[PDB]
Design a protein around this ligand. Structure first.
Ligand SMILES: CNS(=O)(=O)N1CC[C@H](N2CCc3c(-c4cnc(N)nc4)nc(N4CCOCC4)nc32)C1
Length: 852
C-alpha cells in the first residue's frame, strides 16, 4: 500500500524513507509536511484538462523559447515552407506508409495533421504527432518550426519524419496520495551580541583556538573574534566572545561562522582543522538562545582562508567528528525577527543629469567589477532614483550596510516595489552574495514570471546548486523548482538526477534527500522508470569497478569475455535492457548489442555501450543508441562546459551568426560516475592522421585532415562541408579561448563526415589552441578572411552577454569543482572577454591573441 511506495522511493534515493522519520529536527519534519502543498498543486494542475494536461506533463513540448526564426534559418526554407514526412503504421503487418507534405513553417500540429489526412485520402482531429525514433510528441499548438526537432532539421538540412498516432492510443497508456506523516521583538533587545565557546570534543599541533565571525553571505558584519589559544587536549575555553554588533542590527540572514584552527610555531602557521556555520535565526524567525552543540566538517581542498562562510549551514550528521559546544544568550523570552509591517514603520521613521549618467554607467558593469566605497555611498544616497534602472539592484544591494537595521528596513521597501528584471539578471541574486530572503524572493518571483520551461531546463544545474546557499529547507526557490519538476516530466527527470548525483555529499545529502522524497511521492509512474535507471547505473558502476580494480590491465578481448559472462546473469540482463536513457528520457534503451560494446583503451577504461532503439521507426532517427559510461572522471566540469557551449551557440544563432557547435550530452550520475553521448560518425584528428598514414610510416602530417574531408565529401557536398568546418572551427576557437580550455591535442578535437568540428574532454578550464592542419582545411586565401570575420563577431557577441556567463560560473562556486573555488577563478573570463577595455579595444586584444 504506502509501504510499496516508500520502498520504491527508498530505492530511488538510495536511503530508506524511515530514516527521515528518525530525524528529530523540527525543521526537517515541518519541511516534509509543508512541502506537500506544492505536490498537491502540481497534481491538481495535471488533472485540470485531464487527460490532455496529464499527457503534456509526461510528454511536454520540446520547443525553443521564441517562434521568430532568425533571418539565416528562414533562408534555409523554400519560400517560408518546409517539407515534412508523415508516417502511418497501417496494421496488420505494421507497414510504414509515408505521406510527404510541403507546409508553412509556422503551421500548428493540427494543421499538419489535417494536411496529412488530405494527402492520405488522395489515393478527424483525434490524432497526434510523434517524432519518429523517440518518445517525443507535438501535443501543443506551437508553430511547427518552434519545436526543437523541426528547428534542428531546418538547420542540419535533414527532413523531418513524424508519425501520425491516434490520440486514444497514447491517452490509454497514461496511468491513472498524502502521506501518514501529515515573544519579544529582536528590536527591543538593547544589548550587543556575545556567544560563549564552551569546549570541543573529538579533537585529539602546538595550540588550538576557535576562529569566529558574524557574516551575511560571504561578508563579515563586524570584526572576526577568536578564543584564546589552548594546548590541544579536548579544549575547554568557557569564554564569551564579544562582537562589535548590537542584537537589533542583526540582519535576517546573519550567520555565525566558526573554525577550529591550529597554530604551529616556526612566522606562525595557522590552519583550519574543521569548520561549521550556524544561522543566528531558525526557520521560524526565532533568534537562537541557550546551549547548542555543533559537529564540524572537514576543510575543503583549496580553502586558504581560516573561515568557510560560503559553506553549508548546520551540524555534521556524522556525530563522531570535532564537536563544538556553544551557548547563546536567553533574553527571558523567545526572540523573533520583526514582521514586515514593523520593519515598514521603522523605514518611514528613518527619514542631477551628471548623477543619472553616473548611475547608468555603474549599472552596466559586470557582476565581478569592483564597486568602491565612494560608489557604494553614491548608489545608496540615490536609492530612490535606482528603481528607474532596475538592472542596478545587484549593485545597490551590495551598497547597503546589512549590519544597520535602518538601511536594511529602507532596502526592504525598495525591494517590495522593485520592477521585475530578466531571469538571467535575477539569477545573479540567487548566488552566495545575496542571502537575504527578501532579495531571494524577488529573484524567484522574476523567474516564475519570465522563465520558460526551455530556459529553466537550460539553467537547471545552477538552480539546483544555489539550493545549497539557502538558509532553510523550506524556501521560495525550492517551491518554484519542485512545482516545475512535478508539472513537466522532462524537468523532473533532470531535477531528480542533479539531486541524486550529489547524495554522496554529506553537506547536502539530507536537504536533497528530503527534496527527492517529496518529488518521488508526487511524480507518478515515472518513479518506476527512474528505479530502472538507478538499477542499470548501479550494475554499470559494479561492472566498471571490477574492470578498473581486478582486470585493470587485461586485454580488451579478455575484458569482453568477463562482460559477456556477467551479461549471462538474469539480474544483469534485466537491469541493462529495457529502460530510458538518463541522458535523454525520450530514448528507450532496448536490448544490449554486446557485439558493438567495448571497453575503451582510454584512462579509467570507460565502457562504450550500444543498445537497440526499440522505436517502431528507429531507422528514421538512429537504429542504435551509443553511450559512454565512465567511472573515475568528475563529469561536472564537462557538464558545465557543455552547457556554456550550448548557450554561446544560442547567442550566435539569434544574432545571425550560424556558428554550429556540438554540445553533446553529459550527465553526472554520482561521485565521479556518469554518461557521455556518443556523436555518431565522428573521428578524432589523430584517427584521421592514422588513416592517411600507413603501417610503419609517420603518424604525423599536416595535409591529412583536408584529404580525409575531400574523400568523405566529393562533388557539390564539398562546398557545404568546407563551410560547416569553417563555421564550427570558428565557434570552438572562440569558445575554448574565452573559457580557457586546456589539453587541446588532436585526440580531444573531433570531426564528423559532414565537416562539423567539435571538442571533447573538458577536465581543464579557467586557466588559444589551433593547428596548421585545420588552416589547410579552412595561409589567407579569402577563406581565412571570412573565417577571421566570423571569429571577431562571435567574440563580440559573447562579450555582450558576459554578465550571464559570469553569473553561471558564480552560481557553481559552491559545487567543489577544483577549477572553480573563488571569484578569482571566474576573473579569468573577465580577462579573455577584456571587460576592463572598450568594445574596439577588446577586439584588438582578441586579434592579437588570434594572430599569436
Ligand atoms: C571516435 N573514436 S573512438 O575510437 O571511438 N574513441 C577513441 C577515444 C575516444 N574517447 C576517449 C575519451 C572520450 C570521450 C570523453 C571521455 N571523458 C570525458 N570526460 N569527456 C569525453 N568522449 C568521446 N566521444 C565520442 C564522440 O562523441 C562524443 C563523445 N570519445 C572519447 C573515442
Amino acid at each position: 500500500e504506502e509501504k510499496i511506495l516508500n520502498r520504491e522511493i527508498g530505492f530511488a534515493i538510495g536511503m530508506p524513507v524511515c530514516e527521515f522519520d528518525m530525524v528529530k529536527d523540527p525543521e526537517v519534519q515541518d519541511f516534509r509536511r509543508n512541502i506537500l502543498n506544492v505536490c498537491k498543486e502540481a497534481v491538481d494542475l495535471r488533472d485540470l484538462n485531464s487527460p490532455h494536461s496529464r499527457a503534456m506533463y509526461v510528454y511536454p513540448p520540446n520547443v525553443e523559447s521564441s517562434p521568430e526564426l532568425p533571418k539565416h534559418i528562414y533562408n534555409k526554407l523554400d519560400k517560408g515552407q518546409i517539407i515534412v514526412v508523415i508516417w502511418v503504421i497501417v496494421s496488420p503487418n505494421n507497414d510504414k506508409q509515408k505521406y510527404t507534405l510541403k507546409i508553412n513553417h509556422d503551421c500548428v500540429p493540427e494543421q499538419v495533421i489535417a494536411e496529412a489526412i488530405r494527402k492520405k485520402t488522395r489515393s478527424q482531429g483525434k490524432y497526434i504527432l510523434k517524432v519518429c525514433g523517440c518518445d517525443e510528441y507535438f501535443l501543443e499548438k506551437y508553430p511547427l518550426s518552434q519545436y526543437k526537432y523541426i528547428r534542428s532539421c531546418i538547420m542540419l538540412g535533414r527532413m523531418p519524419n513524424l508519425m501520425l498516432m491516434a490520440k486514444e492510443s497514447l491517452y490509454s497508456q497514461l496511468p491513472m496520495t498524502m502521506p501518514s506523516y501529515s515573544t519579544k521583538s529582536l528590536w527591543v533587545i538593547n544589548s550587543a551580541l556575545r556567544i560563549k565557546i564552551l569546549c570541543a570534543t573529538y579533537v585529539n599541533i602546538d595550540k588550538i583556538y576557535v576562529r569566529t565571525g558574524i557574516y551575511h553571505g560571504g561578508e563579515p558584519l563586524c570584526d572576526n573574534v577568536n578564543t584564546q589559544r589552548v594546548p590541544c587536549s579536548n579544549p575547554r575555553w568557557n569564554e564569551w566572545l564579544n562582537y562589535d554588533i548590537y542584537i537589533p542590527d542583526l540582519p535576517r540572514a546573519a550567520r555565525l561562522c566558526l573554525s577550529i584552527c591550529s597554530v604551529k610555531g616556526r612566522k606562525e602557521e595557522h590552519c583550519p582543522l574543521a569548520w561549521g556555520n550556524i544561522n543566528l535565526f531558525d526557520y521560524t524567525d526565532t533568534l537562537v538562545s541557550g546551549k547548542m552543540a555543533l559537529n564540524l566538517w572537514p576543510v575543503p581542498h583549496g580553502l586558504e582562508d581560516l573561515l568557510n562562510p560560503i559553506g553549508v549551514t548546520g551540524s555534521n550528521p556524522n556525530k563522531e567528528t570535532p564537536c563544538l559546544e556553544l551557548e547563546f544568550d536567553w533574553f527571558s523570552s523567545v526572540v523573533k525577527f520583526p514582521d514586515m509591517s514593523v520593519i515598514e514603520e521603522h523605514a518611514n521613521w528613518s527619514v542631477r543629469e551628471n548623477d543619472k549618467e553616473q548611475l547608468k554607467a555603474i549599472s552596466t558593469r559586470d557582476p565581478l567589477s569592483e564597486i568602491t566605497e565612494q560608489e557604494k555611498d553614491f548608489l545608496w544616497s540615490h536609492r530612490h532614483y535606482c528603481v528607474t534602472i532596475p538592472e542596478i539592484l545587484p549593485k545597490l544591494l551590495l551598497s547597503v550596510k546589512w549590519n544597520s537595521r535602518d538601511e536594511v528596513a529602507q532596502m526592504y521597501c525598495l525591494v517590495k516595489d522593485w520592477p521585475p528584471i530578466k531571469p538571467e539578471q535575477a539569477m545573479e541574486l540567487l548566488d552566495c552574495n545575496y542571502p537575504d530572503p527578501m532579495v531571494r524572493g524577488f529573484a524567484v518571483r522574476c523567474l516564475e514570471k519570465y522563465l520558460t520551461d526551455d530556459k529553466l531546463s537550460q539553467y537547471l544545474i545552477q538552480l539546483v546548486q544555489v539550493l545549497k546557499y539557502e538558509q532553510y529547507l523550506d524556501n521560495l526557490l525550492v517551491r518554484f523548482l519542485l512545482k516545475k519538476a512535478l508539472t513537466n516530466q522532462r524537468i523532473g527527470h533532470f531535477f531528480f538526477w542533479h539531486l541524486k548525483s550529489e547524495m554522496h555529499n554529506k553537506t547536502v545529502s539530507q536537504r536533497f534527500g528530503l527534496l527527492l522524497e517529496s518529488y518521488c511521492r508526487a511524480c507518478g509512474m515515472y518513479l518506476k522508470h527512474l528505479n530502472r535507471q538507478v538499477e542499470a547505473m548501479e550494475k554499470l558502476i559494479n561492472l566498471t569497478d571490477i574492470l578498473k580494480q581486478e582486470k585493470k590491465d587485461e586485454t580488451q578481448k579478455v575484458q569482453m569475455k568477463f562482460l559477456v559472462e556477467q551479461m549471462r546473469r538474469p539480474d544483469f540482463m534485466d537491469a541493462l535492457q529495457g529502460f530510458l536513457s538518463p541522458l535523454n528520457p525520450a530514448h528507450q534503451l532496448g536490448n544490449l548489442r554486446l557485439e558493438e560494446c567495448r571497453i575503451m583503451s582510454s584512462a579509467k577504461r570507460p565502457l562504450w555501450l550500444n543498445w537497440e532503439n526499440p522505436d517502431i521507426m528507429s531507422e528514421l532517427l538512429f537504429q542504435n543508441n551509443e553511450i559512454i559510461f565512465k567511472n573515475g572522471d568528475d563529469l561536472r566540469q564537462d557538464m558545465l562546459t557543455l552547457q556554456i557551449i550550448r548557450i554561446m551557440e544560442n547567442i550566435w544563432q539569434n544574432q545571425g551568426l550560424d556558428l554550429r557547435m556540438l554540445p553533446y550530452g553529459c550527465l553526472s550520475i554520482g561521485d565521479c560516475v556518469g554518461l557521455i553521448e556518443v556523436v555518431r560518425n565522428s573521428h578524432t584528428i589523430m584517427q584521421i592522421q592514422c588513416k592517411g598514414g600507413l603501417k610503419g610510416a609517420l603518424q604525423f602530417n599536416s595535409h591529412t585532415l583536408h584529404q580525409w574531408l575531400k574523400d568523405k565529401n566529393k562533388g557539390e557536398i564539398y562546398d557545404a562541408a568546407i563551410d560547416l568546418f569553417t563555421r564550427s572551427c570558428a565557434g570552438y576557437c572562440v569558445a575554448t579561448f574565452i573559457l580557457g580550455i586546456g589539453d587541446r591535442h588532436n585526440s580531444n578535437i573531433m570531426v564528423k563526415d559532414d565537416g562539423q568540428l567539435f571538442h571533447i574532454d573538458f577536465g581543464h578550464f579557467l586557466d588559444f589552441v589551433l593547428t596548421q592542419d585545420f588552416l589547410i582545411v579552412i595561409t589567407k586565401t579569402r577563406e581565412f578572411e571570412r573565417f577571421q570575420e566570423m571569429c571577431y563577431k562571435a567574440y563580440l557577441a559573447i562579450r555582450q552577454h558576459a554578465n550571464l556567463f559570469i553569473n553561471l560560473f558564480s552560481m557553481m562556486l559552491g559545487s567543489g569543482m577544483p577549477e572553480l573555488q573563488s571569484f578569482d577563478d571566474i576573473a579569468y573570463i573577465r580577462k579573455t572577454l577584456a571587460l576592463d577595455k572598450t568594445e574596439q579595444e577588446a577586439l584588438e586584444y582578441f586579434m592579437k591573441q588570434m594572430n599569436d
